[PDB]
Short mmCIF file of C-alpha atoms in Angstrom, two decimals:
data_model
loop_
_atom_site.label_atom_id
_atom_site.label_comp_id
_atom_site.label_asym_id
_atom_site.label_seq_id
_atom_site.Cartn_x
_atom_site.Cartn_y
_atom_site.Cartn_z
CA UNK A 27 154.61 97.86 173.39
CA UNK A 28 152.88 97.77 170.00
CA UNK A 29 150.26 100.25 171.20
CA UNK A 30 152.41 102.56 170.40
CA UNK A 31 152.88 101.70 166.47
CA UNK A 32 149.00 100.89 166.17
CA UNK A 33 148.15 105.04 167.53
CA UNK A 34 151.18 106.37 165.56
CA UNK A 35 149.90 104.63 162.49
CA UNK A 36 146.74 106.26 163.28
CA UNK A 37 148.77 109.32 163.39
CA UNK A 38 150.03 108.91 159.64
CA UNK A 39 146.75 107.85 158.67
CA UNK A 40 144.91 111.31 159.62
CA UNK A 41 148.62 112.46 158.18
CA UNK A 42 147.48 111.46 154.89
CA UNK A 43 143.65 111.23 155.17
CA UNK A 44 143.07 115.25 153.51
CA UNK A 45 144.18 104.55 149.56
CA UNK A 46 146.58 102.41 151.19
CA UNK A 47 145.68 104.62 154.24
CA UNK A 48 142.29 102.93 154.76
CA UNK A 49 143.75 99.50 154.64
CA UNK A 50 145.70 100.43 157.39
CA UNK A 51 142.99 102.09 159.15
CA UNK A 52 141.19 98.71 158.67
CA UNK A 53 144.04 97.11 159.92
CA UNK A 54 144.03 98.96 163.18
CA UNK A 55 140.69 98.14 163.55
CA UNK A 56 141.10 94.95 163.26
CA UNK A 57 143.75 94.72 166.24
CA UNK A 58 141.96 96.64 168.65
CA UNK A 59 139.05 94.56 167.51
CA UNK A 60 141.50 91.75 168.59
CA UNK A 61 135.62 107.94 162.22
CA UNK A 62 138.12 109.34 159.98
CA UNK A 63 137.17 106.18 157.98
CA UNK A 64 134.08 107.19 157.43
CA UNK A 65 135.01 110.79 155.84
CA UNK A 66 137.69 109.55 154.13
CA UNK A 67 135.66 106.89 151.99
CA UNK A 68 132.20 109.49 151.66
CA UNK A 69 135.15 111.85 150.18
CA UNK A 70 136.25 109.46 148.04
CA UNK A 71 132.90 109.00 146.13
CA UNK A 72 132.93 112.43 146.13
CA UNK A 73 136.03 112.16 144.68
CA UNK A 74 134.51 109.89 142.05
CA UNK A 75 131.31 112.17 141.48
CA UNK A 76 134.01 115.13 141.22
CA UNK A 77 136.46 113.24 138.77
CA UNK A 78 133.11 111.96 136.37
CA UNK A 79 131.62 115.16 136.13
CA UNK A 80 134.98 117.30 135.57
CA UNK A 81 135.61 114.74 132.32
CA UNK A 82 131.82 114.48 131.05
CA UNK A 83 131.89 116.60 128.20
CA UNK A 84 129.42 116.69 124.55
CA UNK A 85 131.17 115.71 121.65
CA UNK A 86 131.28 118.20 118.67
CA UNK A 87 130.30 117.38 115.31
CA UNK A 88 133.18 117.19 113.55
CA UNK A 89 135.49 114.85 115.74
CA UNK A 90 137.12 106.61 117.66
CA UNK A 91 135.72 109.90 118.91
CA UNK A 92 137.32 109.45 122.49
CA UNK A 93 135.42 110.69 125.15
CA UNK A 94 136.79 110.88 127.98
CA UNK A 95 141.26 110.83 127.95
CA UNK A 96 143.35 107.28 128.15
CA UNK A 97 145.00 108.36 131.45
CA UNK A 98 141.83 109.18 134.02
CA UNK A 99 140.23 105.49 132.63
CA UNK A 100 142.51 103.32 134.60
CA UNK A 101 141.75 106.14 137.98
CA UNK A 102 138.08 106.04 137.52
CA UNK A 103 138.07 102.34 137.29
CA UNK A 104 140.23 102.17 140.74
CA UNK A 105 137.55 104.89 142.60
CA UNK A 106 134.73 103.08 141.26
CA UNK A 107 136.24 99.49 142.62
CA UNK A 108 136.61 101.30 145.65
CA UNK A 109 132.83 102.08 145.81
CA UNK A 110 130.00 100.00 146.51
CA UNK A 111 123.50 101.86 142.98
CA UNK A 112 125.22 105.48 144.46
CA UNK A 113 127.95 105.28 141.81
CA UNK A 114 125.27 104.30 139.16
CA UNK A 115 122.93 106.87 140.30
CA UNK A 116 125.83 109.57 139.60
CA UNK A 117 126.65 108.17 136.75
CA UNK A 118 123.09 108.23 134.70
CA UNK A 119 122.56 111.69 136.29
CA UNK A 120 125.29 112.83 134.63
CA UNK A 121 126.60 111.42 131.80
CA UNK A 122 122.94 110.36 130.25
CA UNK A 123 122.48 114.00 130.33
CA UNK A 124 125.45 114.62 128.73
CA UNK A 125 124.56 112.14 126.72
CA UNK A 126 121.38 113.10 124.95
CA UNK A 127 122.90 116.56 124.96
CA UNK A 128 125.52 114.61 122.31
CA UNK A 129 122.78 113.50 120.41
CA UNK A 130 120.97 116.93 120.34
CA UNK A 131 124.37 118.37 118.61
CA UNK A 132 123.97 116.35 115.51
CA UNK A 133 120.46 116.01 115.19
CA UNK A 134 117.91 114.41 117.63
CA UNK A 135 114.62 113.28 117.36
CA UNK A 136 113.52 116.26 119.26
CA UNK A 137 101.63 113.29 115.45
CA UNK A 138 103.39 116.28 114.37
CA UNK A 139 105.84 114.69 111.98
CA UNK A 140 102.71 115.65 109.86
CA UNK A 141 104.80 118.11 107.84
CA UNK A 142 105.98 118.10 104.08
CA UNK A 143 107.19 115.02 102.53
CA UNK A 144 109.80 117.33 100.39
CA UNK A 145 111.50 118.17 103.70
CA UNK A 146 110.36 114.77 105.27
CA UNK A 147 112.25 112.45 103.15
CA UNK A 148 115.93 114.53 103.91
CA UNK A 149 114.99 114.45 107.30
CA UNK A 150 114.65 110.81 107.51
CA UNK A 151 117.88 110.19 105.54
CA UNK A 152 119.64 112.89 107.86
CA UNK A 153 117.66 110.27 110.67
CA UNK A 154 119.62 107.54 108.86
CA UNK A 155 123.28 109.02 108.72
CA UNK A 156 122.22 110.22 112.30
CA UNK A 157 121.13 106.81 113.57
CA UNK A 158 124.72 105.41 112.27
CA UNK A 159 126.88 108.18 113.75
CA UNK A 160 124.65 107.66 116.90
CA UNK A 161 125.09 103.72 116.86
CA UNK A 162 128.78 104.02 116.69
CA UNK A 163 129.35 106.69 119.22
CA UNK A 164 127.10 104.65 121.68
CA UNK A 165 129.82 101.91 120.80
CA UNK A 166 132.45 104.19 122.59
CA UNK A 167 130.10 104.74 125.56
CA UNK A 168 129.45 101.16 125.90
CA UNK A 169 133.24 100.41 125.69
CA UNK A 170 134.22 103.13 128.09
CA UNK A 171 131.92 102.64 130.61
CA UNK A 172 132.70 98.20 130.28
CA UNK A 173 136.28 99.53 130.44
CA UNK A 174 136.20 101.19 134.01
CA UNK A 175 134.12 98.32 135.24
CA UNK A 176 135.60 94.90 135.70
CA UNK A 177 128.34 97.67 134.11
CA UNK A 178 125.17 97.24 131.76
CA UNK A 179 122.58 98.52 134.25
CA UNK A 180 124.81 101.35 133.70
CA UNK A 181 124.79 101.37 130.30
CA UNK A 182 121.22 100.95 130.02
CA UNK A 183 120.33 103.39 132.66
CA UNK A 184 122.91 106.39 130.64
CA UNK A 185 121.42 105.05 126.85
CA UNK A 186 117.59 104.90 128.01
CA UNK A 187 117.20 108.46 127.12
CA UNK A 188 119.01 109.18 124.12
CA UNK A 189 117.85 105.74 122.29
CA UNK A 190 114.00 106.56 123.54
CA UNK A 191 114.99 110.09 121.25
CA UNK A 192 116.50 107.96 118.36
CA UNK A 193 113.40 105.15 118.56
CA UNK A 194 110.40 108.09 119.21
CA UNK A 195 111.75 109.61 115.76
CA UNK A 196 110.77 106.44 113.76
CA UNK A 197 106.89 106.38 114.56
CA UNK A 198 105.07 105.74 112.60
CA UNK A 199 106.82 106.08 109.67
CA UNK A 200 99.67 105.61 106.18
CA UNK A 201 99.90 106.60 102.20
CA UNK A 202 101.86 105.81 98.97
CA UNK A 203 105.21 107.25 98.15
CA UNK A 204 106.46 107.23 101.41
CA UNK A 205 106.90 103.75 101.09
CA UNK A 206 110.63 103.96 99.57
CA UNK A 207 111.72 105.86 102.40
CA UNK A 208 109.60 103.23 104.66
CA UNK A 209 112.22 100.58 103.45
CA UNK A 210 115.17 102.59 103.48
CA UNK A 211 114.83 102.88 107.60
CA UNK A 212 114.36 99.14 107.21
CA UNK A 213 117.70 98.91 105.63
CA UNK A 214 119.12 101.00 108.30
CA UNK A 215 117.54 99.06 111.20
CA UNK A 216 118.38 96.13 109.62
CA UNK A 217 121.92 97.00 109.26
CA UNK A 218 122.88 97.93 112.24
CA UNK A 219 120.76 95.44 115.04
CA UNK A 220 124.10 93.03 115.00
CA UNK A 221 126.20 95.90 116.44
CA UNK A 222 122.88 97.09 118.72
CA UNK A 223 122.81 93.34 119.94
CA UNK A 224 126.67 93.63 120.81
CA UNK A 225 126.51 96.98 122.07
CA UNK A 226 123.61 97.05 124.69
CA UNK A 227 124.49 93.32 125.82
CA UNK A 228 122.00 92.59 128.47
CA UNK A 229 120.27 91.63 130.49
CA UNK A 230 118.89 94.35 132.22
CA UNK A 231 119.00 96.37 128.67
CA UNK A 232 117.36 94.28 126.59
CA UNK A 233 114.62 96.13 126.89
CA UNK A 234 116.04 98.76 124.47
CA UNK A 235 117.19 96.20 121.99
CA UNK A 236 113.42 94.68 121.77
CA UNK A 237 112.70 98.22 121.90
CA UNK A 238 114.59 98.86 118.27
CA UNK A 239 113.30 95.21 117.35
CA UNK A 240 110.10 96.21 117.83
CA UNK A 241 109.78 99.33 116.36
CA UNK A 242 111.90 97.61 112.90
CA UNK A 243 108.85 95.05 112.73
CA UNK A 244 106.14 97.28 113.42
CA UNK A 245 108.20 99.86 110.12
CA UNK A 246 107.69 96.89 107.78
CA UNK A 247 104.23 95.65 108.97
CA UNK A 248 103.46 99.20 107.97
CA UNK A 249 105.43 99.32 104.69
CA UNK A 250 103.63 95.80 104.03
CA UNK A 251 100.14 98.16 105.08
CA UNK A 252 101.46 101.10 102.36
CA UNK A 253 101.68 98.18 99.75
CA UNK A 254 98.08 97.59 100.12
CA UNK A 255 97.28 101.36 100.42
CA UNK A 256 98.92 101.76 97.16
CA UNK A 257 97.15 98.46 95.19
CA UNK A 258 93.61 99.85 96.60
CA UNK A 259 94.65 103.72 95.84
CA UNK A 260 95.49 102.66 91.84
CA UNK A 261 92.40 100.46 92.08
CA UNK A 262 89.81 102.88 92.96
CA UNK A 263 91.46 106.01 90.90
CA UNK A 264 89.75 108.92 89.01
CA UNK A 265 90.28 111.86 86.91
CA UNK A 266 91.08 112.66 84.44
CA UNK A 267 91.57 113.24 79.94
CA UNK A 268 94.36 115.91 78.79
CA UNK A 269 94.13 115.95 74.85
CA UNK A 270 91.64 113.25 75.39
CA UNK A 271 93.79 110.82 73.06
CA UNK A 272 94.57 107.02 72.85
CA UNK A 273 97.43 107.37 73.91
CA UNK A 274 99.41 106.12 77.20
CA UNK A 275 97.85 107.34 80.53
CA UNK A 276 100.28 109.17 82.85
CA UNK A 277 98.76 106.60 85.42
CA UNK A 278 100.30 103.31 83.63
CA UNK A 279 103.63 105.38 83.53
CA UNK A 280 103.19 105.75 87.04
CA UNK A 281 102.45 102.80 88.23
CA UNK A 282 105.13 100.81 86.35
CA UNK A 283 107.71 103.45 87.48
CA UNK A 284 106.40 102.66 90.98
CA UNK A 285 107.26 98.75 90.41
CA UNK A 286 110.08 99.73 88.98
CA UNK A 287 111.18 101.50 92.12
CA UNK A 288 109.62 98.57 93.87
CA UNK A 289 112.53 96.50 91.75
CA UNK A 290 115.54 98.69 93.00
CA UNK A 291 114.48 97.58 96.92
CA UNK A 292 114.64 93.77 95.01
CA UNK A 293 117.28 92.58 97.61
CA UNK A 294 115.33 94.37 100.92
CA UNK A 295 112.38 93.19 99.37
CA UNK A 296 113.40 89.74 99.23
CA UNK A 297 113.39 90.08 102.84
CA UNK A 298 109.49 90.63 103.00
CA UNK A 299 108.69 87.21 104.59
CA UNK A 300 107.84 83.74 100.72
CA UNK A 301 110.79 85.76 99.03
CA UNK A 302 110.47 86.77 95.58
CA UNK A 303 106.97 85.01 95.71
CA UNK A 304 105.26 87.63 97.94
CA UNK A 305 106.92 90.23 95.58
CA UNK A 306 105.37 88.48 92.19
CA UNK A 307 101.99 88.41 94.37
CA UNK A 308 102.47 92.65 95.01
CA UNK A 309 103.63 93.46 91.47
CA UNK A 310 100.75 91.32 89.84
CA UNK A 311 98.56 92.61 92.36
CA UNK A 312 99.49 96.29 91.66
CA UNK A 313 99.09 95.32 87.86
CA UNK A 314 95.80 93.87 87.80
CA UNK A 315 94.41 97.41 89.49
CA UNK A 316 96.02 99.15 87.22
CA UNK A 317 94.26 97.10 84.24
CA UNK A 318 91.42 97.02 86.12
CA UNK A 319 90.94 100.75 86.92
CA UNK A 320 92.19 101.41 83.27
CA UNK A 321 89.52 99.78 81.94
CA UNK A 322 87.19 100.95 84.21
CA UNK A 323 87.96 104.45 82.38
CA UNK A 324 88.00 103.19 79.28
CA UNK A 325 84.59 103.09 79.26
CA UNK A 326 84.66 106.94 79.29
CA UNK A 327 84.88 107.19 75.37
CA UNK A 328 83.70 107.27 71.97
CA UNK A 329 83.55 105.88 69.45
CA UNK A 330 84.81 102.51 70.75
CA UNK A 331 87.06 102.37 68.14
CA UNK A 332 89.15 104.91 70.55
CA UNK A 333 88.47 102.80 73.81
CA UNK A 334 90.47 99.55 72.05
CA UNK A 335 92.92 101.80 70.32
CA UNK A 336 93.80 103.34 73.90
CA UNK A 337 93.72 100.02 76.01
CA UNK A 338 95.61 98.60 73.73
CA UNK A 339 98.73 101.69 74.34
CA UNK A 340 98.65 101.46 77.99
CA UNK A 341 98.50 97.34 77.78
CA UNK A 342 100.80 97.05 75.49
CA UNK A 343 102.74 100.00 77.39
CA UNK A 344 102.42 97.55 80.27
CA UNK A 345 103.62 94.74 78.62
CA UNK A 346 106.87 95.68 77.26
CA UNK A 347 107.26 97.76 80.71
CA UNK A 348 107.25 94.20 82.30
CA UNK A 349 109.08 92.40 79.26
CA UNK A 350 112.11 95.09 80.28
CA UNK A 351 112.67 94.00 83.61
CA UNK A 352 110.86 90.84 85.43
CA UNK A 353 109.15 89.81 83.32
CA UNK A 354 111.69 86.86 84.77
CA UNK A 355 110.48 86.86 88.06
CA UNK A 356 107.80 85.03 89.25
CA UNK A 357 105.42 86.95 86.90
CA UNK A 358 105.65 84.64 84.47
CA UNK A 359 105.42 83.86 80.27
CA UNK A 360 102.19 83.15 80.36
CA UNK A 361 101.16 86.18 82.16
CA UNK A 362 102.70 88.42 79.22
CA UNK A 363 101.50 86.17 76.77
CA UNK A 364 98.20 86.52 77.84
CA UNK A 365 98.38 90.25 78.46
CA UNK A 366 99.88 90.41 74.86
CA UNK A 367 96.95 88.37 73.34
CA UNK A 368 95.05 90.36 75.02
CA UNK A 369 96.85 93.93 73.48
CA UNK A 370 96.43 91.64 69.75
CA UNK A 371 92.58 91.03 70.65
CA UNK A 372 92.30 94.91 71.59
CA UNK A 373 93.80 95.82 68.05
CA UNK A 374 91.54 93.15 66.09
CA UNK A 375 88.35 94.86 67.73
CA UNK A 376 89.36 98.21 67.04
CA UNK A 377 89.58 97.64 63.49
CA UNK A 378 86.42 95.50 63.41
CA UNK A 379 84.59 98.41 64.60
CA UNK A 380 86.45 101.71 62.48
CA UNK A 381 86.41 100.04 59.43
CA UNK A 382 83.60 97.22 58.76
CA UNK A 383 80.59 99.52 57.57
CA UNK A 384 83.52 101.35 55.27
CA UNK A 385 84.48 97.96 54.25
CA UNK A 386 81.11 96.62 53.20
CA UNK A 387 80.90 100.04 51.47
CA UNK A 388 83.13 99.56 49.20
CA UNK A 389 81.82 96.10 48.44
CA UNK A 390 79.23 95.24 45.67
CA UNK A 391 76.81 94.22 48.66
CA UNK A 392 74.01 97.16 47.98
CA UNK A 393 74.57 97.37 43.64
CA UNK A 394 72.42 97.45 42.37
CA UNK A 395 75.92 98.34 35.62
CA UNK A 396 74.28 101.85 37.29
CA UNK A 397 76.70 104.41 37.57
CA UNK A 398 74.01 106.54 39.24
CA UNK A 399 74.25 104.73 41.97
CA UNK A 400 77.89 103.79 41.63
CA UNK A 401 78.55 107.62 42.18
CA UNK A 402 76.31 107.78 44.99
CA UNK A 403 78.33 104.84 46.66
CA UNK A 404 81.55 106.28 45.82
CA UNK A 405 80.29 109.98 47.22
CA UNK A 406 79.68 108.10 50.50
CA UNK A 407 82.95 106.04 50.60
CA UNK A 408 84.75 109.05 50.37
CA UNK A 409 82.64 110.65 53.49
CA UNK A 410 83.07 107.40 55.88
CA UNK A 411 87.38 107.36 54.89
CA UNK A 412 87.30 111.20 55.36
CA UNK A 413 85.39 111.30 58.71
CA UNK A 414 87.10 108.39 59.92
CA UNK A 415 91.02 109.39 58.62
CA UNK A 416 90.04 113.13 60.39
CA UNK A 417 89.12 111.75 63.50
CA UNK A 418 91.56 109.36 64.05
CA UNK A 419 94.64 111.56 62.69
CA UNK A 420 94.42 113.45 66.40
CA UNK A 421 94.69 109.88 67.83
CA UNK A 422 98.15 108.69 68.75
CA UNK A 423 99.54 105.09 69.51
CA UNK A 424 103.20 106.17 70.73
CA UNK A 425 104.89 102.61 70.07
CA UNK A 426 106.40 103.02 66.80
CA UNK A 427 106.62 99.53 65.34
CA UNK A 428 103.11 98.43 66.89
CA UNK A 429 101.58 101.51 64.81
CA UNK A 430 102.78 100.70 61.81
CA UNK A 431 102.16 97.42 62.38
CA UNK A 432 98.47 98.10 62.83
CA UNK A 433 99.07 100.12 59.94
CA UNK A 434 99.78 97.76 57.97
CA UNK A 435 96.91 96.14 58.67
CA UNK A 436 94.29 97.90 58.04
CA UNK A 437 96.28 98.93 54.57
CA UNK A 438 95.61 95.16 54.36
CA UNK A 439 92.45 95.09 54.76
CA UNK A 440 91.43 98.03 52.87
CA UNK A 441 93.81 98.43 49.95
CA UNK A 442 92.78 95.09 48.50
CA UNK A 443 88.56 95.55 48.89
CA UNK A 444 89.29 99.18 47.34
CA UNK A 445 91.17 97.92 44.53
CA UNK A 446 89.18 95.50 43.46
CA UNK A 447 86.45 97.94 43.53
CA UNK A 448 88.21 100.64 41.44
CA UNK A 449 89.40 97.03 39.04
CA UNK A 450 85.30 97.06 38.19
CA UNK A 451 84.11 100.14 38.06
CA UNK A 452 85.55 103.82 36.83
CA UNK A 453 85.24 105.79 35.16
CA UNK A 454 81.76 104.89 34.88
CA UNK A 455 85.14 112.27 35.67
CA UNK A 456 87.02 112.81 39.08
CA UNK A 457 84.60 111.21 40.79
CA UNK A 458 87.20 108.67 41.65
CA UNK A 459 89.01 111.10 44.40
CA UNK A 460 92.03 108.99 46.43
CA UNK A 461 93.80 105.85 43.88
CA UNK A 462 95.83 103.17 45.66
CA UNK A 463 99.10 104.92 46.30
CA UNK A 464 97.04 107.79 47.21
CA UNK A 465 94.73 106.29 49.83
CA UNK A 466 97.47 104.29 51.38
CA UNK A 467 99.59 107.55 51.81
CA UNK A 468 97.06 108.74 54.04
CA UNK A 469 96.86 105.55 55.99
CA UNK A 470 100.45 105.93 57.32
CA UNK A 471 99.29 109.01 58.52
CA UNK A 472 96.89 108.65 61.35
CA UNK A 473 97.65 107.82 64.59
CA UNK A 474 100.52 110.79 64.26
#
């Protein structure tokens, strides 16, 4: 008869129709070859659409963060092998939603990141833990959504959104200071474009991958561009005295706390691209404006005397800054030998110019025995030694040793010429104001 079977079939297939059903449906299509189909399969996406968007949920801060439970994967895989751009359409509609909406509960890169930088730089390292959390939570997306298909136009098409959020916050970051931070989102790009490469796969995603690429090289082209900012921003600096002083200028302290910084991102750095050569180049670089603006304010004084004593602080300052740390880098020994000839030659001038005309003072070059004179000579000695020990007691050279270094010096050069002038004449009283002991007790006394 078989007729029979084939409409009873039919019968248990509208029996049931309200999987293997539609196989048989296919099957009795196939004999008579030899409706209900329709509804049954446009209910069954339906069914899919219905079965996605009753598990599509935003994950709370605070909880392998599983997304969706272990039992529907396996159902949603079978529905969606069922299926033949419709299931993908669902699919981003939905679940990208819900998927930015994830990103919005823990942070979100919601031109106007013109704000403070004291607020900024948290921000960006809140960007940082948030671009980690984000990068392994897209990991679970990926693997679900590679787990119900046996599937990266998918992925791309969900991710597109919530990655554009995560990338837009980046951009741009042009001034000092914010460089640190500049590198830090380096590191962070950096450390996570392996797993971004295995996550987003490809090909028709890659886009978002060169996307995160892209926006890495274009952070350090403009961390290299905030290096050069910085070199031309020490170079052509300004203002201004405090206590006027010879001492160390709150610049040099600043700039070799910046390369210092500069030295803690050593191992990023290295990465500039060449290595530690580039670095040596930035350092020196950064150096020779400080010098060079340091001395283009040194001119700002008088008597010169002060000029040398202050160039050589914040030279010397400079020097031992770099003979503390690298110094072995591609800086060199020759570059803080010269530098510390330089401090020497700085020193030497100083006390060519202080103490020459009190020098040749208390010579015999001018006498004329006399006495008259004599006193006259002595009366203006102990002017030049008073005006000079009173104006240069306010001065300060903070390194210890190198003060009483040039201390000694200039005890060295005085003490004897004095002597030998008081091993000549006096009494010929109390005319004779400061002896040796006396005059060199004063002498460790300036520069305090």
């Amino acid at each position: 008869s078989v007729i029979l079977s084939q409409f009873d079939l039919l019968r248990q297939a509208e029996t049931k129709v309200l999987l293997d059903a539609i196989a048989q449906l296919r099957k009795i299509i196939r004999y008579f070859m030899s409706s209900l189909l329709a509804k049954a399969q446009s209910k069954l996406e339906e069914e899919f659409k219905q079965l996605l968007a009753s598990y599509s949920k935003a994950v709370e801060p605070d909880r392998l963060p599983i997304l969706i439970p272990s039992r529907v994967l396996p159902l949603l895989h079978d529905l969606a092998q069922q299926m033949v751009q419709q299931l993908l359409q669902i699919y981003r509609d939905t679940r990208s939603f819900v998927l930015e909406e994830s990103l919005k509960k823990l942070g979100v890169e919601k031109d106007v990141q013109r704000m403070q930088w004291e607020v900024l730089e948290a921000k960006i390292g809140n960007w940082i833990h948030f671009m980690r959390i984000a990068v392994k939570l897209l990991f679970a997306g990926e693997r679900q959504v590679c787990d119900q298909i046996f599937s990266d136009q998918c992925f791309a098409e969900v991710t597109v959104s919530s990655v554009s959020m995560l990338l837009s916050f980046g951009d741009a970051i042009r001034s000092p200071e914010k460089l640190f931070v500049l590198l830090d989102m380096y590191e962070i790009m950096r450390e996570l474009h392996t797993e971004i490469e295995t996550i987003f796969k490809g090909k028709a995603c890659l886009e978002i991958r060169d996307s995160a690429t892209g926006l890495t090289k274009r952070l350090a082209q403009t961390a290299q561009e905030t290096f050069g900012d910085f070199e031309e921003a020490v170079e052509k600096d300004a203002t201004k005295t405090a206590v006027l002083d010879g001492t160390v200028h709150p610049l040099t302290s600043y700039v070799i706390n910046y390369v210092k910084f500069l030295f803690d991102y050593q191992t990023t750095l290295k990465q500039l691209f060449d290595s530690n050569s580039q670095l040596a180049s930035v350092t020196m670089r950064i150096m020779q404006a400080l010098q060079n603006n340091l001395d283009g304010k040194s001119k700002q004084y008088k008597d010169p005397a002060l000029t040398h004593l202050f160039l050589m602080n914040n030279i010397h300052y400079m020097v031992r800054s770099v003979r503390r740390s690298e110094a072995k880098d591609l800086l060199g020994d020759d570059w803080v030998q010269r530098h510390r000839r330089i401090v020497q030659q700085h020193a030497n001038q100083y006390k060519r110019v202080a103490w020459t005309k009190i020098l040749q003072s208390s010579s015999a070059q001018g006498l004329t025995v006399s006495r008259g004179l004599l006193k006259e000579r002595f009366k203006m000695f102990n002017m030049q030694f008073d005006e000079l020990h009173q104006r240069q007691s306010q001065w300060t050279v903070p390194d210890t040793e190198l003060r009483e270094s040039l201390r000694l010096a200039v005890a060295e050069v005085l003490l004897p010429a004095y002597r030998s002038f008081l091993k000549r004449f006096g009494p010929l009283q109390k005319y004779i104001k400061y002896t040796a002991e006396d005059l060199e007790r004063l002498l460790g006394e300036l520069f305090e």
